[PDB]
Structures are given as C-alpha cells and as structure tokens.
C-alpha cells in the first residue's frame, strides 16, 4: 500500500542526514571575501517597446538575442550596439528564447504552446521559420539547444520533452513533476539537465535514459530560475520566497542559502560567473544582486533598472553581464 | 565617426533601418485596443454577436479591437497573468441565473475580488457584464440593483479604476457599450499622460 512509500521517503531522509557532517559555512572560513565590487552600464540596448522576459548570450560572447511582448526577436552586436537582425513573431505572448551553440538558429516560445526554430543563415538573406514544434498542452517556459538539431523544452503541463528538429517529433518525454515547470539548464557536457517546477521541487533528468536521476526539495514556494555551476556538479535555484540556494548533485543536499531580511520579493533569474565565485540574481524590487556564492554574503548591486528584472546572462568568457527588465531596456555591465 | 570602416558604416545604416522598422511597427501596434476577457459564464454568448490563448478581431467605428480568452489555459493564473498588464480594459461576464443553486455567485465574487484587486491590474478598468436576464426574470428591479451594488463594492482601489456595468439589451448594445467604455478609458488615460488631471 502507501505505507511503503512513506517508509522509503523517511529512510531516504535518514540516509541524507547521515552524510551532512559539515555545511558550507565552516569549510569556507580562511577564504578571502570578494568585497564590494562595482559594475557600470557600458552599453544600453534600446529598441524594445514592451516587457522583456528572456535574453540569451551567443557562443562567441558578442551576439545576443532577446524577446519581448511586441512580437519581436532582436539580435544585437553588443560591441557597437548595432542590430544584426529583427525577427517578427507570429505570437506576441513569448516568455523564452534560445541561441544555438553553432550560431545558426534561434528559438522562441510562450503562451501559444508552440516552439519555433528560426534559421539565421540562409541564401535569401532573411530569417525564416525552419520548424515548428507542437505537442505541449501547457505553455512553454524554457528552451535550450542541445546541438545543431536537438532542443529540450519545458512547458506548463508538468512535462519536459526532448525534440528532434529534423522530424519535428518528440524523441523523449520527461514526466514526474506535479507542478508547472518554469526553468531549464543544460550541463556543460550536455548529458544531463535540471528542471525547476512550481511544486517547490527540482529534479535531475537524464537525456539518454529518459528518466529522473534524483530530486531536490527545500523550497516552500514555486521555483522560477535554475542554472548549473560551471563544473556541472552543482546548481543554484531561485524562487519567489526571496531565497536562493545551491544544491550538490553528488551530495544530494542543499549547501548554502542566499537570503537576507531586507529582501521580500521573488527571484526571477539567476546566473553564475565563469569561475563560479559570483552568483547573480535578478529580483522583483527593480535591482539585481551579486552574491559571493561561497560565503552567502552580498557583494554588489545592479540598480540601473527602473522595473522588474526578468532575465540575466553572462558571456562564455565572463567579460560582461547582460540584464533585461520590464522597462524594455537591456544593459551591459562590466 | 571617422574611426569606422566602410562595412561598419553599412552595418550602422542597417541598424538604423531596423530601428525605423521597429518604430513604424510599434506605432501601428499602439493603435490596437487590448481587451482581456474573463469569466467562469456566458462568455460564448457575449462573443456570439461579435490550444493556448484564444483571440477575436472586430472593428467598430474605426477602432480595431483585440479580445483574449483564457479559458483554455488550465494552469495557475499567478504565472502568466502579468503578461496582460497593460490592456485597455478587462471584460468580466457573470450570469444572473446562478443565485439559487449549488453557489456560483460566491465563486464569481471571489474571482472578481482576485482580479479587480490584483497587484498588476490596479490602473486597468473593468467592464462588467450581467449576461443572463431572461432566465433571472423568473423569481425585481430592487434585486437587480442589490446584485449590481454588491458586485460593485469589491473595488478596493476605488479611485484609480472604474467599473462600468451593463445588463445584457439582447442585441447590438453589447458592442456599443464596450466602445463607450474604451473611449472613456482612452480619454482619461490621456489626461494622465499629459498631467491635466
């Protein structure tokens, strides 16, 4: 009956408690603090006329794609603040965007339950739709390219699906969440990915096998953002209860919590740095926060914006940080 | 700038043309009147005369109207309702022939309290529709005034928004009333933009 499930859930907690010998508070005591760090808006990206919910950095750390409610995808240069491309979307209700690792495609999705892939390099000189993905009952919230012809999508129907662009059909379907799935993050080796849901829980998936490896709890509110550590052995979680925390895949625990009494708003986007000792979180009180990510102490504030910060992103070389917001502006910090 | 090459100048020209196209599209997108349709409840009857997000288009006196139906989104509204922050007006449909049964009236008032006092639709007006009138006639004016006032008082921010109420007026009144409410909302919006208030 259901007694075995309760006993197994109790014993997995007992096994979890048998490994927590030292939390991530006493291990890092002799380490020098980062200290106060200041970033200035090197570039401001104007051209959007509505709320921005998603931005993605290119692989070359120069190009950038952003989405907004005006039915527009804009590709920026970010060095000379030019606009490489402007892609009009059929559905103006978009909440996610992606950039292919090869630089040949971009993806978008939202309330229309449709993931669209656009070809950026055609002989005709214009960007056109290459494939449309259908099969999600709920609205899509995140999409990330695995390779040139493989994408993973997260929707609001408590499911995650692995697609094949060539045939336009679901290759693998990931099920097991009891709430709306909000965020996705791909591992550096592109063999695993983590998923955040509105059931206050996140779990690790396997792309090849197609089944969940482990699940992580601890939050008491819906998860909004997720991202791995650069080494791929850890990931950070953002939720609406003003708390960010870090989980370890090998330890299957929660390491440190990044919270403060002055903050009561929710976290919308998170992102690490190149070395991993700088976690950046976008909050709902109109300013980003910069965290030590190893001592749970704030070390910077990005207060340039005048509305809710919705998306964050660092470059692959770590040279800059791009943030979007609900005031239709993107700012490059360095 | 004298420090640019020829290709950089051509790229800047392309970026300027993109900017011009974006402005010329946003200008045309600022003449759409954005309506969000809600209910529980006769919404089909309200749209009859004139998968994800549903839409509808119709023209009345040179105004182009967008309606949105959210009955097909079987998910919690706390995640995607902020996408509609900025609509001209919110249409709300309530059927009067549910006062004595098990009670849809209490659910309707709870939904109204949740949507009228929402933290995002603080400055968005609410167009309120009493759909059922023939069925409600069976088991009058005092009761209708009572129900109207009862639905009216839930407005917590009683200064920054107005709740226009109709009594659908079987034919053709439904559109005209929305046109009058949209014109009034636009007029009062401009005074806020210019500071004339």
């Amino acid at each position: 009956l259901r007694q075995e499930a309760e006993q197994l859930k109790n014993q997995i907690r007992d096994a979890r408690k048998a490994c927590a010998d030292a939390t991530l508070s006493q291990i890092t005591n002799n380490i020098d603090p980062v200290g106060r760090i200041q970033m200035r808006t090197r570039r401001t990206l104007r051209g959007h006329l509505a709320k921005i919910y998603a931005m993605h950095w290119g692989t070359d750390s120069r190009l950038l794609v952003s989405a907004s409610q005006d039915g527009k995808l804009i590709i920026w240069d970010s060095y000379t603040t030019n606009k490489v491309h402007a892609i009009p979307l059929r559905s103006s209700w978009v909440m996610t965007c992606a950039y292919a690792p090869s630089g040949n495609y971009v993806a978008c999705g939202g309330l229309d339950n449709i993931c669209s892939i656009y070809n950026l390099k055609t002989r005709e000189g214009n960007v056109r739709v290459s494939r449309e993905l259908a099969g999600h009952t709920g609205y899509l919230s995140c999409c990330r390219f695995l390779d040139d012809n493989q994408i993973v999508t997260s929707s609001g129907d408590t499911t995650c699906a692995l697609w094949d662009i060539e045939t336009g059909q679901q290759t693998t379907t990931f099920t097991g969440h009891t709430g709306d799935v909000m965020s996705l993050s791909l591992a550096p080796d592109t063999r695993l990915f983590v998923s955040g849901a509105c059931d206050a829980s996140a779990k690790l998936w396997d792309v090849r096998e197609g089944m969940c490896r482990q699940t992580f709890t601890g939050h008491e509110s819906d998860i909004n953002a997720i991202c791995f550590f650069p080494n791929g052995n850890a990931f950070a979680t953002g939720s609406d209860d003003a708390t960010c925390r870090l989980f370890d895949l090998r330890a299957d625990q929660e390491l440190m919590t990044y919270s403060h009494d002055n903050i009561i708003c929710g976290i919308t986007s998170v992102s690490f740095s190149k070395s991993g000792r700088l976690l950046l979180a976008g909050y709902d009180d109109f300013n980003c926060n910069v965290w030590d990510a190893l001592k749970a102490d704030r070390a910077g504030v990005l207060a340039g914006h005048d509305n809710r910060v919705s998306c964050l992103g660092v470059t692959d070389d770590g040279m800059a940080v791009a943030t979007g917001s609900w005031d239709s502006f993107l700012k490059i910090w360095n | 700038g004298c420090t640019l090459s020829a290709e950089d100048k051509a790229a800047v020209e392309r970026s300027k043309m993109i900017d011009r196209n974006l402005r010329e599209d946003g200008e045309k997108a600022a003449r759409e009147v954005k309506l969000l349709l809600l209910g529980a409840s006769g919404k089909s009857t309200i749209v009859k005369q004139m998968t994800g997000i549903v839409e509808t288009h119709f023209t009345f006196k040179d105004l182009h109207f967008k309606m949105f139906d959210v009955g097909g989104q079987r998910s919690e509204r706390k995640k995607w309702i902020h996408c509609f922050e900025g609509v001209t007006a919110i249409i709300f449909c309530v059927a009067l022939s549910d006062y004595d049964l098990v009670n849809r009236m209490h659910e309707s008032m709870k939904l109204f309290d949740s949507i009228c006092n929402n933290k995002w639709f603080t400055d968005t007006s609410i167009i309120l529709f009493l759909n059922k009138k023939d069925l409600f006639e069976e088991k009058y004016e005092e009761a209708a005034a009572y129900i109207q006032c009862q639905f009216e008082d839930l407005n917590k921010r009683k200064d920054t928004k107005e709740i226009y109420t109709h009594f659908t007026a079987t034919d053709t009144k439904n559109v005209q009333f929305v046109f009058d409410a949209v014109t009034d909302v636009i007029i009062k919006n401009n005074l806020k933009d210019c500071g004339l208030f």
Partner: single-chain antibody
Amino acid sequence: VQLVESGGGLVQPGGSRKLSCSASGFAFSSFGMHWVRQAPEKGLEWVAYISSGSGTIYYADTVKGRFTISRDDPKNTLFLQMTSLRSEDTAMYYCVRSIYYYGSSPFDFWGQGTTLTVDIVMTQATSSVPVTPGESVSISCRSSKSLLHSNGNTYLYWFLQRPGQSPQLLIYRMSNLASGVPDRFSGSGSGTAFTLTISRLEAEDVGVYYCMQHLEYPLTFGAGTKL
C-alpha cells in the same frame, strides 16, 4: 538567387545607354548592390555602389558625374544610367549583391554579366603559373598600405574567374572561407603581404585570381594571376 542583366549592345561614342539587372530568389530590399566592370584585357574595376535603403551612393573617381545608379525595391530591379560614353568604357559589366552585418559575406553572388562595346594600390607580381593537378600552389599579392583595421578586421577578398564564367567569392576578410567552397582553399596574411594557398589542385581550379580590398572606397582590384 539569380541575377539576370540586360542593356548591353553596341553604342556610338558620346551617346547614352541604360543597364538593368533583374534580381530574383532573395530579399533584394535588404542587399546593397555594386557594379564591377571588366575590360577585354584581364582586370577588374569597381564602378559604383548603392546602399540597402538607397541612403548611401558611391562612385569610382573615373566615371563619377556621368554615371547614375538607382534601384526599385518594389520591382526588384537595379539600374545603372550611363551618359557620354568614351572609348575606355568598353567592358563586361557585372552586378554584385552585398549585405553588411557582423559576420556577413559582402561579395558572395555575382551576376551573369552584360557586355557593352563603344587610392590603395593592390599589385600582383605573378601573372601566370604552369602547374599540374595534385600540386599545392600559393598566390600572393601586396598592398599599398596596411589593410588591418583597428577593430581587428583585415579587409581583403579573393575571387576566382573561370574561363567563360562569372567571378566567385572564395575568401572574405582574408581569413574566412565562403560558403559552398571546398576546404582546400585557405587564406592568410599580415597587414600588407597576403597569400592564398590551394592544396590538392583539381581540374576546376583553373582561372584568374583577383585580390580586392574593402578598407575604404574606392575598392581596388589586383592585376590577375592566370592558372
């Protein structure tokens, strides 16, 4: 992607003649268009240029004033108005499409060509090289000044013109390889001296090779090396 040209023929000196190019198969409204002419003697000479939005127009300092370039984006047609034609205007005229953003190929497609009968210096010391297939060849050309801009771009382009055929882009910005070109070709250089290296030469590599600069208008071509 196909450009068809018309307007050529025989014209008496001192007259006028209009050339038209009909674009088809691509978004002509987002491409800048050049005109490049070729005399019966081996060589190339840039003539004019019109921007994507018709806001920028350039000419070479030899036909400026008497030549007019125009486009009609509704009709997808490019025009070149020529007046007071001299005896030195007998050339084979080509239409070249151009798009300019970060990472684009500005001289990828050339037209079929039309015939009419009536500054930085790029030099190519080599004129002809006898060679057999399967042997690697090196083609080098020098520049009057350094082509490396401060932003890191070396504006050098490479073109191959097979006999009885239109020129084709091979290398753009002196490093990158054009699409549809086999990886046998390779480009290299440093500031002033540049070289083009071809490995495993095949029977389709015969032709004349030109190196073109794009640092500042007017654009200047090389002499041409025959293989």
